Structures are given as structure tokens and as C-alpha cells.
Design a protein around this motif. Structure first.
Motif, short mmCIF file in Angstrom:
data_model
loop_
_atom_site.label_atom_id
_atom_site.label_comp_id
_atom_site.label_asym_id
_atom_site.label_seq_id
_atom_site.Cartn_x
_atom_site.Cartn_y
_atom_site.Cartn_z
N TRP A 14 0.81 -1.22 -0.07
CA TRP A 14 0.11 -0.02 0.06
C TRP A 14 0.78 1.14 0.00
O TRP A 14 0.25 2.32 -0.07
CB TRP A 14 -1.00 0.05 1.17
CG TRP A 14 -0.15 -0.57 2.37
CD1 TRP A 14 0.77 -0.21 3.18
CD2 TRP A 14 -0.60 -1.85 2.77
NE1 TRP A 14 1.05 -0.91 4.35
CE2 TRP A 14 0.23 -1.94 3.98
CE3 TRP A 14 -1.17 -2.94 2.50
CZ2 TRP A 14 0.36 -3.20 4.97
CZ3 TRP A 14 -1.23 -4.15 3.32
CH2 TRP A 14 -0.36 -4.43 4.59
N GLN A 15 2.26 1.02 0.07
CA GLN A 15 3.16 2.32 0.22
C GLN A 15 3.05 3.16 -1.35
O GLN A 15 3.13 2.44 -2.31
CB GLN A 15 4.57 1.79 0.29
CG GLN A 15 5.67 2.98 0.51
CD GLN A 15 5.20 3.73 1.91
OE1 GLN A 15 5.04 3.03 2.76
NE2 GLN A 15 5.24 5.07 1.81
N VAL A 16 2.82 4.41 -1.04
CA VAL A 16 2.95 5.07 -2.29
C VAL A 16 4.00 6.17 -2.12
O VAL A 16 4.09 6.64 -0.92
CB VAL A 16 1.42 5.75 -2.51
CG1 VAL A 16 1.46 6.70 -3.73
CG2 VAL A 16 0.31 4.50 -2.69
N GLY A 29 5.69 10.35 1.25
CA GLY A 29 5.20 8.98 1.22
C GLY A 29 3.79 9.31 1.06
O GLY A 29 3.29 10.43 1.36
N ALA A 30 2.96 7.92 1.05
CA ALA A 30 1.64 8.19 0.96
C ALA A 30 1.06 6.72 1.09
O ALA A 30 1.92 5.66 1.20
CB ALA A 30 0.94 8.69 -0.29
N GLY A 197 3.34 9.31 4.74
CA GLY A 197 3.35 7.65 4.62
C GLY A 197 2.56 7.24 5.80
O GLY A 197 2.18 8.01 6.65
N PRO A 198 2.20 5.93 5.56
CA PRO A 198 1.33 5.23 6.68
C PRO A 198 1.79 4.75 7.72
O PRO A 198 3.12 4.39 7.71
CB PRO A 198 0.59 4.10 5.97
CG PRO A 198 1.51 3.86 4.84
CD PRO A 198 2.41 5.13 4.48
N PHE A 199 1.22 4.94 8.95
CA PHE A 199 1.85 4.28 10.28
C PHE A 199 0.67 2.97 10.30
O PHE A 199 -0.34 3.36 10.67
CB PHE A 199 1.58 5.21 11.43
CG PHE A 199 1.99 4.72 12.71
CD1 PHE A 199 0.90 4.00 13.52
CD2 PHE A 199 3.24 4.66 13.11
CE1 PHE A 199 1.03 3.50 14.66
CE2 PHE A 199 3.56 4.20 14.67
CZ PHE A 199 2.51 3.70 15.60
N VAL A 200 1.17 1.73 10.15
CA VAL A 200 0.36 0.76 10.20
C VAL A 200 0.35 -0.29 11.46
O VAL A 200 1.55 -0.34 12.00
CB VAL A 200 0.25 -0.10 8.93
CG1 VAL A 200 0.03 0.82 7.57
CG2 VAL A 200 1.77 -0.76 8.78
#
Lengths: 247, 32
Positions: A14-16, A29-30, A197-200
Motif C-alpha cells: 500500500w506504500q505510495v 510517502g503516501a 506515509g502510513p503508520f500501520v
């Protein structure tokens, strides 16, 4: 990312990565939340102090990438943006409250073994996993100098009182901080380049990955004893849905 | 198109394979 390790192929599908069109430069990041919607931080798109105010046509995103320097034929995909939506109450002059933005891809991306959406948290997952001590994950490229492949770091959520005393800015409930104590029991962290970016976190209950936060402000890879902040995704979930459902 | 299959990675959860550090995250989730 600093003091992290090499991510494995397809570990963060899912990293963009958000790029400036011209001149080409990695900006942030996104994360991919559907075949046409991408989540990121508002300061990645709008930050007046640095004369930043991007429009759809100034950017592009690359998805499914593992190596920063080499092109991954038939794996990575590139996409232009149809529209950008920044939270109306995003506060860039003070505390970066509601630092969130959505980007709609011009054309839906095809999912693959390397491209797959992350889940948005539901109430139970948020109430259950958003606890001090619990670790979340951030991925991005090295600018440790730079990287070859995607880097990963696992960071513990910090007690709210400790977050509050780590900075003089007025924090809100729409943000949380994560990171290891400066004395070093460990020491990885997200950097300026990982902004947006995401923190998952992975739910032990259903084995799925959920994006609990969005990497907020950062400068270089040093926070001088401070902790990085993250936009609380669940708290802003209705806004996300409002935007997607209408546009 | 994730709402349904979101968060399950093709090269990991789908193949019953775990990555190198997810253990660190799951072990950190204490109280229930």
C-alpha cells in the motif's frame, strides 16, 4: 527512515511515493486505500512558509516500488492525479492539527502481488490498538546517506503526557506521537522524507493491517530528543468518507 | 477496491507467510 532494516518484497504493498513532476524529486510517502484513492499528509501538498502549494498537475505517484534507484519493470506503476483534497481545518501555522489530504488517481491502479490497499481502522480496532507501548510500523526510503531498497521501522506509541512535554506546540487529540525514548532501548524513526506515509498496525484479531496514522512533520532525520507525530486516522475517518463519497 | 480484501498482503497473509518483524508488533500488544 533512520536506523531501520530492509523491507521484504511486497511487505508494504500500500506504500505510495509522491513526486514533483518537474524537476523530478521525491517529496513524500503516501498510502493506497482503494484502487483510485491515496492518503497523505497535508503539509506534503500545502505549506505556505516554504512556498508550497501544489496543484494536481504538479505531481505524480509511483506505486509498487521496492528499490528507490532502479526501475522495476512490470511491477511499479505510475499515475497522475485527478484531484487533491486538503482538510479545510488543516492548521499549518501552529500545530499541524488535521494534517491530512486525499489524492484521487486519474485512472485506477491494478492491484497485484506488489500493489494492494491497506484498511482504514474501525472503532474497535482503534480502541483496541491505539495504546501506549503498542508498536506500529512506518516504511520509507533511506535518508538514513540514501537507500537502495525500502526501509522499515517499528515504533511504540507514546504516553500522551510524555508527548505533550516533548514539544511546546499545542497538541490536539487528532494526533498521537510514537518513538523510542532518547536514551536508547532501541532507536529507529521516520524522517522528513517519510512525511505523509502510513503508520500501520496488524490486528491480531483478523490478521489484517490497518493504517492508524499518517507521518506528520519532520526535518531531516533528527528530532532532537522529540517524538514524531502522527495524524489520527480513525478520528478523521468521516472526513475521508465525506470526500470519497462526494467526489 | 480494498474494503473487502484490504490489509491482507498477497505475498504474506495470503500465502501464510510472515515478514521478518511483524512478530515485534504483535508481541507489543498486551492488555486485552
Amino acid at each position: 527512515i533512520v536506523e531501520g532494516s530492509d523491507a521484504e518484497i511486497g511487505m508494504s504493498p500500500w506504500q505510495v511515493m509522491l513526486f514533483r513532476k518537474s524537476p523530478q524529486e521525491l517529496l513524500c510517502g503516501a498510502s493506497l486505500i482503494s484502487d483510485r484513492w491515496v492518503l497523505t499528509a497535508a503539509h506534503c501538498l500545502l505549506y505556505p512558509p516554504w512556498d508550497k502549494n501544489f496543484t494536481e498537475n504538479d505531481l505524480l505517484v509511483r506505486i509498487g516500488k521496492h528499490s528507490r534507484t532502479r526501475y522495476e519493470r512490470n511491477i511499479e506503476k505510475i499515475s497522475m492525479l485527478e484531484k487533491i483534497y486538503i482538510h479545510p481545518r488543516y492548521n499549518w501555522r501552529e500545530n499541524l492539527d488535521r494534517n491530512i489530504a486525499l489524492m484521487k488517481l486519474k485512472k485506477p491502479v491494478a492491484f497485484s502481488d506488489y500493489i494492494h490497499p491497506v484498511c482504514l481502522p474501525d472503532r474497535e480496532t482503534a480502541a483496541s490498538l491505539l495504546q501506549a507501548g503498542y508498536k506500529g510500523r512506518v516504511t520509507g526510503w533511506g535518508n538514513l546517506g540514501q537507500p537502495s531498497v525500502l526501509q522499515v521501522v517499528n515504533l511504540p506509541i507514546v504516553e500522551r503526557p510524555v508527548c505533550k512535554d516533548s514539544t511546546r506546540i499545542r497538541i490536539t487529540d487528532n494526533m498521537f506521537c510514537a518513538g523510542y525514548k532518547p536514551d536508547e532501548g532501541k532507536r529507529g524513526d521516520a524522517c522528513e522524507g517519510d512525511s505523509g506515509g502510513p503508520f500501520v498496525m496488524k490486528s491480531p484479531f483478523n490478521n489484517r493491517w490497518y493504517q492508524m496514522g499518517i507521518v506528520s512533520w519532520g526535518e531531516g532525520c533528527d528530532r532532537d530528543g522529540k517524538y514524531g507525530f502522527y495524524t489520527h486516522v480513525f478520528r478523521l475517518k468521516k472526513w475521508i468518507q465525506k470526500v470519497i463519497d462526494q467526489f | 477496491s480494498g474494503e473487502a480484501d484490504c490489509g491482507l498482503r498477497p505475498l504474506f497473509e495470503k500465502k501464510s507467510l510472515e515478514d521478518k518483524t511483524e512478530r515485534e508488533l504483535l508481541e507489543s500488544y498486551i492488555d486485552g
